[PDB]
Amino acid sequence: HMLKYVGVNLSGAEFNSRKKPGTLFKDYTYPAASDFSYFAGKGMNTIRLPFLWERVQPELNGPLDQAQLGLIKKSLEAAKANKQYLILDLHNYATYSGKRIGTSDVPAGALADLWRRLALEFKDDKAVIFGLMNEPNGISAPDWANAAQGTITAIRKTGAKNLILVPGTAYTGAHSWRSTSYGVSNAKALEILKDPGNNLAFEAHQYLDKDYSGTKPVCTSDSVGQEKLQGFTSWLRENKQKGFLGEFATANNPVCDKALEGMLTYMEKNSDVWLGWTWWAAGAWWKPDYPFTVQPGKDGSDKPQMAILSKYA
Ligand SMILES: OC[C@H]1O[C@@H](O[C@H]2[C@H](O)[C@@H](O)[C@H](O)O[C@@H]2CO)[C@H](O)[C@@H](O)[C@@H]1O
Ligand SMILES: OC[C@H]1O[C@@H](O[C@H]2[C@H](O)[C@@H](O)[C@H](O)O[C@@H]2CO)[C@H](O)[C@@H](O)[C@@H]1O
Numbered sequence: 263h264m265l266k267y268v269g270v271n272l273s274g275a276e277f278n279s280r281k282k283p284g285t286l287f288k289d290y291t292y293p294a295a296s297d298f299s300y301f302a303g304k305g306m307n308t309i310r311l312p313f314l315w316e317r318v319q320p321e322l323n324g325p326l327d328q329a330q331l332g333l334i335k336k337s338l339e340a341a342k343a344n345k346q347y348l349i350l351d352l353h354n355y356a357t358y359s360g361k362r363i364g365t366s367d368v369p370a371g372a373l374a375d376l377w378r379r380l381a382l383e384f385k386d387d388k389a390v391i392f393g394l395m396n397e398p399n400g401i402s403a404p405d406w407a408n409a410a411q412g413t414i415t416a417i418r419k420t421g422a423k424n425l426i427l428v429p430g431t432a433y434t435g436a437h438s439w440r441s442t443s444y445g446v447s448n449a450k451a452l453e454i455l456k457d458p459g460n461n462l463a464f465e466a467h468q469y470l471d472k473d474y475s476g477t478k479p480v481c482t483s484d485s486v487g488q489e490k491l492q493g494f495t496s497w498l499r500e501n502k503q504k505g506f507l508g509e510f511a512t513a514n515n516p517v518c519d520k521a522l523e524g525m526l527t528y529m530e531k532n533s534d535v536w537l538g539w540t541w542w543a544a545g546a547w548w549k550p551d552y553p554f555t556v557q558p559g560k561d562g563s564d565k566p567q568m569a570i571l572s573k574y575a
Contacts, residue, residue, distance in 0.1 A: 263305065263307070263538075263574060263575045264530040264533050264574075265529060265530065265533055265536055265537065265538040265539065265574075266537050266538050267307060267308040267347055267391075267506070267537055267538030267539070267540075268305070268306055268307060268308055268538050268539060268540075268571075268574065268575045269301060269306035269307060269308035269309050269310070269346070269347075269538075269539075269540050269541070269575075270301055270306060270308075270309065270310070270540055270541045270542075270543065270544045270556060270571075271309075271310040271311075271312060271351075271509065271540050271541065271542050271543040271544065271545070272293040272297055272298075272309055272310070272311055272312075272337075272543070272544055272545045273312055273542070273543040273544070273545040273547070273548070274290060274291040274292065274293065274312075274545040274546065274547045275290050275291065275292050275311065275312055275313040275314070275317070275333070275353075276290065276312035276313060276314050276353040277289065277290045277291070277547060278290060279314055279316075279353075282314075282316045282317070282320070282359065283316070283317055283320060283327070284317065286329075286333070290314075290317070291545075291546065291547060292333045292334075292336065292337055293309075293311070293337060293340070293545060293546070294546060295340045297340075297544065297545070297546070297557075298337075298340040298341055298343070298344045298346060299340075299344055300558055301344075301346075301544070302344035302345065302346060304564075304568060304571070304572045304575060305572055305575030306346070306571075306575050307345065307346050307347060307575075308346060308347045308348075308349065308391075308538060308540055309337075309341055309346050309347070309348050309349065309540075310349040310351050310393065310508060310509075310540040311334070311337055311348055311349060311350060311351055312351045312353035312396065313330070313334065313350070313351065313352070313353060314352075314353060314354065315352050315354045315358055315376060316354075316358060316359055317330050318330045318331065318334070318352075318376075318380075319376050319379070322358060322368065322372045322375075323372055323375050325379075326379050326380075326383070331383065334350065338384075338387070338389065338390065341389055342389050346389070347389050347390075347391055348389055348390055348391065349391040349392075349393045349427065349508075349540065350380060350384070350390060350391070350392055350393055351393035351396055351508070352376065352377075352393060352394065352395055352396065353396040354395060354396060355395075355396060355397050355398065355399060355400075356395055356397075356398035356399065356400065356401050356406065356409075356431075357400075358372065362400050362401060363398075363401060363406075363409055364401055364405050364409070370405075370408060370409040370412050371412060373394075373395070373409055373412070373413050374412040374413050374415070374416035375416070377392065377394065377413045377416050377417050378416040378417070378419070378420060380392065381416070381417040381420040381422040381424070382420050382422075384422070384424065385420055385421055385422035385423070385424065387424070388424075390424055391424060391425045391426075391427060392417060392422075392424055392425070392426045392427065393427045393465065393508065394410060394413050394414075394426060394427060394428055394429065394465075395410075395413075395429055396429070396508075397429065397433040397434055397467065398429055398430070398431045398433075398434065399431055399432060399433050400431075401431050402431065402445060402446065402451075403430060403431050403432075403445070403446045403447060403448050403450070403451035403452070404446050404451045405431075406430065406431040406451070407451040407452050407454065407455060410428050410429075410452075410455065411454075411455055411456070414426055414428065414455065414456075414457050414462070415458075417459075418457065418458050418459045422459070423459050423461060424461070425461050425462070425463060426457065426459075426461065426462050426463075427463055427464075427465040427506050427508060428452070428455065428462055428463070428464055428465060429464070429465045429466075429508070430448030430451070430452060430464070430466070431448060431451075432448060433467065434448070434465055434466050434467050434508070435466065435467060435468065435474055436466035436467065436468040436490055436491050436493070436494040436507070437468060437474055437490040437493075437494075438474075439466065439493055439494040439497060440493045440494075440497065449493075449497050452464065453501060462503070462504075463503070463504040463505055463506045463537050464494075464498065464503055464504070464505050464506070465505075465506045465507075465508040466491075466494050466505060466506075466507060466508070467507070467508055467509040467510065467542075468487065468490055468491060468507060468509075468510045468525070469509075469510065469511060470482060470486050470487050470490075470510075470511075470512055470518065470521055474490070476509075476511055476542065476554065479513030479514075479515070479518075479553035479554075480513065480518075481512055481513065481515075481517050481518040481521040481522075483517070483521065484517050484520035484521050484524065485520075485521065485524050486521055487510070487512070487521045487522065487524055487525030487528070488521075488524045488525045488527070488528035491507075491525060491528055491529070495528075495532050495535060495536070498535035498536075499534070499535050503535070504535055504536070504537045505535055505536055505537060506536075506537050506538055506539065506540075507529065507536070507538070507539035507540070508539075508540055509540065509541075509542040509543075510525065510539060510541060510542065511541060511542045511543070511553075511554035511567075512554075512567065513553040513554065514553065514565075514566040514567060519567075519570060522567065522570050523570060526539075526570070526571075526573075526574045527574075530574065541554075541556060541567070541571055542554055543555065543556070543557075544556045544557040545557055554567075556568045556571065
């Protein structure tokens with residue numbers, strides 16, 4: 263890999279998110295240790311690990327759930343054993359129990375408290391990367407930027423020097439990073455962020471279907487991926503920042519495979535600002551027909567997209 267961090271999302275701990283606490287192995291699962299070694303064997307040195315705020319912190323501003331923390335720590339042991347980095351992805355869409363950050367129910371400070379506590383747990387660990395929030399939306403760019411600043415500040419107050427991945431609002435889409443149609447863009451809002459620890463990257467996501475949701479197994483052209491990354495890439499360069507593609511995916515077809523090669527090549531060519539990427543997704547709980555799975559088969563066989571991902575790892 264020409265990029266520092268390449269790998270996959272191991273999805274499953276965030277499943278059935280309505281269920282709180284939910285029951286391990288019934289409503290959600292953590293990854294098998296064998297998942298980590300499989301992806302390591304393909305050249306991937308980074309795992310993004312979705313998990314739920316509600317499961318790790320059952321009451322806002324309250325203590326962390328020790329069982330949930332233990333599961334995260336067990337995944338960290340597996341990552342370290344396989345010489346991987348682990349992104350702790352608070353996979354929450356700027357909500358807690360269905361209520362948006364910024365409402366009276368969920369003040370921005372509550373997210374800062376969550377991250378204070380996780381930072382205290384993982385500060386002494388070079389393998390751990392802090393993924394502040396999966397796909398904030400339903401909150402303005404300046405309000406989200408304020409929430410993000412509070413969270414960065416809370417992490418740094420603990421002494422933690424770990425890399426922080428900071429998203430924008432609008433589902434942190436790379437394509438829409440500079441859009442001012444509806445008001446202030448992520449680009450403008452996030453210009454004012456300060457990290458006293460100087461170890462930040464901006465997390466964007468990019469899907470290649472008509473509305474960039476990853477709802478359909480279509481890539482709208484064989485070049486749309488790289489095209490949609492350009493504005494964000496320039497913004498990184500303009501601001502002397504780094505970026506991380508926290509989710510992206512393409513379906514198993516010729517146009518999509520061309521688009522995938524194009525976007526991976528594009529990030530390599532622009533590795534001055536792209537720190538890395540994590541494909542969506544692997545994990546043991548996807549159905550056989552899920553168009554973006556790279557979880558190896560029960561037969562041990564590689565999924566179609568893995569042959570391309572492995573080339574860039
Ligand atoms: O229906 C299967 C499973 O889906 C889970 O949500 C998935 C969703 O299917 C996928 O489109 C999206 O990209 O990822 C999420 C997981 O983060 C859902 O959590 C489960 O309740 C459901 O059984
Ligand atoms: O990008 C993944 C994310 O997409 C969400 O859909 C958004 C889409 O990103 C955005 O470009 C479009 O304008 O609006 C839709 C929402 O209607 C999707 O809802 C998420 O589940 C998904 O993770």
